[PDB]
Design a protein around this ligand. Structure first.
Ligand SMILES: [Cl-]
Length: 137
């Protein structure tokens, strides 16, 4: 963009609050250890994306046993909703919301698309989940 204008998307890859979200996994694993494992795992399973899934702050919902997932890039957000919903025995009337950088990702996006836009410097994609549709509420 030197003869044309480069636009900025709306509410897509923004992270206005909290910046990069706070995660217990980051506090418990130092950065260089995470980055080293992220690089190696992207080379070993290039068709899969490493995802960290943790409960959002103030969320009222069952905790997740395993937080480290290796997800096929072609998998959509909706299928990931389906998978996480089963692992915590969510009832039919229980809601489930994902947040990536304090933003709800489109249900029709693939995990590879989210990875490319939101992966952090350790080569991991971080997803928080909640029973509420607003992060931290
Ligand atoms: Cl990808």
């Amino acid at each position: 963009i030197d003869d044309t204008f480069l636009p900025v998307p709306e509410y897509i890859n923004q992270s206005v609050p909290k910046g990069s979200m706070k995660f217990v996994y980051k506090e418990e694993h130092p950065f260089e250890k995470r980055r080293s494992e992220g690089e190696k795992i992207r080379k070993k399973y290039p068709d899969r994306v490493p995802v960290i899934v943790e409960k959002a702050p103030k969320a009222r919902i069952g905790d997740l046993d395993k937080k480290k997932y290796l997800v096929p890039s072609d998998l959509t957000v909706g299928q990931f909703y389906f998978l996480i919903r089963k692992r915590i025995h969510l009832r039919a009337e229980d809601a489930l919301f994902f947040f990536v950088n304090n933003v709800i990702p489109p249900t029709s996006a693939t995990m590879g698309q989210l990875y490319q836009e939101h992966h952090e410097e350790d080569f991991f994609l971080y997803i928080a989940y909640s029973d509420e549709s607003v992060y931290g509420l």
